[PDB]
């Protein structure tokens, strides 16, 4: 039944100020701690500082320099500050809740019990950029036995995330997309392929959906053989 | 600060087998003060147990905990597809909490040869003044592969990257994209463009070529 909702800007500047908060439903703050916990991407999980209602805040000593956490108990809400950023802060950011009730200091903590989601803050001096979509088209060089494979390269983007579809999701089976790798230009390339019959191609369309958000962009890309 | 090293780091097992977890804290702890958490790529770490055995509700039986000391173990006594997952210890005993880095818990499935795909790059992007070749590495366990760019047999490095997508629901392969990055100077200063592929089932490494000017 408690749940959470985020919000809070994702995409800053280096030296910026991250201001992140989250509302709790479902459930009162009170009696409870309450903390924010990050990941970076394919990396594990770290603990940032808890609050509860009152007021009391247990900050990471590896952070307590740059990091601040608020509490409004009248809108049920809690609220962390981070300064001093850096690209290293680029990571997905989650509210949780402990898993027992704890009052303002009890020196061994509970378990986290409910998390939320998590939301990606992205730190970096690069600015939003729009990516370029270029087909990956089906050749002699891309077929294996009735099987021909096509796909679309999105190139130089940031930040992220970006969604790809096929078809505009009519088209799901044998299709692949890829993480992103970070270049180093500071923007993102990923790619999304598929395999359809060698003898679809001619007669059936195959068009590559690409929605980035952040620069407002979204490009539909139709993928002809050689 | 409470370092926690998991242990293995990876573990390939199949539904219907047991599978055993350790987390190793740089000091000694109480049980009462450990937890374990499941994450599926994609979304929010779950709670399975706390205080060392306790199971979090939802949680079935055949998850397992225990250890005192330095030394705490989980147990998924059989496995089932819904556990196979990244999983995570954590000790809240000492400020401040730590995790450990983790211990995936992969499909043991048959040995899967890629099927090996490549694309030169496409005229929209030539007239970008850049040119990227990917290669298609499809349907293939297990994850350990090798990707090779040559161009005109020269050898390339620093100038490619790779991406692994997540292990896949229905079949449990992996397949990995590779991109190959040059200006188009570069690029057209040569002929021979070629993807080599290493894989535990193939008998010999796959070569996919072609030539500028196809």
């Known amino acids: 039944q408690v749940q959470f909702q985020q919000w809070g800007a994702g995409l800053l500047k280096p030296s910026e100020t991250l201001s992140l908060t989250c509302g709790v439903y479902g459930g009162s703050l009170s009696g409870y701690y309450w903390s924010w916990i990050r990941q970076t991407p394919g990396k594990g999980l770290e603990w940032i500082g808890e609050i509860n209602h009152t007021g009391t805040t247990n900050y990471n000593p590896s952070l307590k320099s740059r990091v601040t956490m608020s509490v409004d108990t009248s809108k049920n809400q809690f609220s962390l500050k981070m300064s001093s950023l850096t690209a290293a802060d680029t990571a997905l950011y989650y509210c949780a809740r402990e898993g027992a009730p704890r009052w303002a200091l009890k020196r061994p903590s509970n378990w986290f019990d409910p998390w939320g989601q998590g939301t990606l803050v992205t730190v970096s001096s690069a600015s939003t950029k729009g990516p370029s979509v270029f087909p990956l088209a089906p050749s002699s060089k891309s077929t294996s036995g009735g099987t021909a494979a096509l796909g679309c390269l999105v190139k130089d983007y940031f930040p992220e995330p970006v969604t790809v579809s096929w078809n505009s999701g009519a088209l799901t089976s044998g299709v692949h997309t890829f993480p992103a790798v970070l270049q180093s230009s500071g923007l993102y390339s990923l790619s999304s392929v598929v395999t359809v019959p060698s003898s679809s191609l001619g007669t059936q369309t195959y068009i590559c959906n690409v929605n980035h958000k952040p620069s407002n962009t979204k490009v539909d890309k139709k993928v002809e053989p050689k | 600060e409470i370092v926690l090293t998991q242990s293995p780091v990876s573990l390939s097992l199949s539904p219907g087998e047991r599978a055993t977890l350790s987390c190793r804290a740089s000091?000694?702890?109480?049980?009462?003060?450990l937890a374990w958490y499941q994450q599926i790529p994609g979304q929010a770490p779950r709670l399975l147990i706390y205080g060392a055995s306790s199971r979090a509700a939802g949680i079935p039986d055949r998850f397992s905990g225990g250890g005192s000391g330095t030394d705490f173990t989980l147990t998924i006594s059989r496995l089932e597809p819904e556990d196979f997952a990244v999983y995570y210890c954590?000790?809240?005993?000492?400020?401040?909490?730590?995790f450990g880095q983790g211990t995936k818990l992969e499909i043991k499935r048959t040995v899967a040869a890629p099927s090996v795909f490549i694309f030169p790059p496409s005229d929209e992007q030539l007239k970008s003044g850049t040119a990227s070749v990917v290669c298609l590495l499809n349907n293939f366990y297990p994850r350990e592969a090798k990707v090779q760019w040559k161009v005109d047999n020269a050898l390339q490095s620093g100038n490619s990257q790779e991406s692994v997508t997540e292990q896949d629901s229905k079949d449990s392969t992996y397949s990995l994209s590779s991109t190959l990055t040059l200006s188009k100077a570069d690029y057209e200063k040569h002929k021979v463009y070629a993807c080599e592929v290493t894989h535990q089932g193939l008998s010999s490494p796959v070569t996919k070529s072609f030539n500028r000017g196809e």
């Open positions: 954590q000790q809240y005993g000492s400020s401040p909490r730590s």
């Open positions: 000091q000694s702890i109480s049980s009462t003060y």
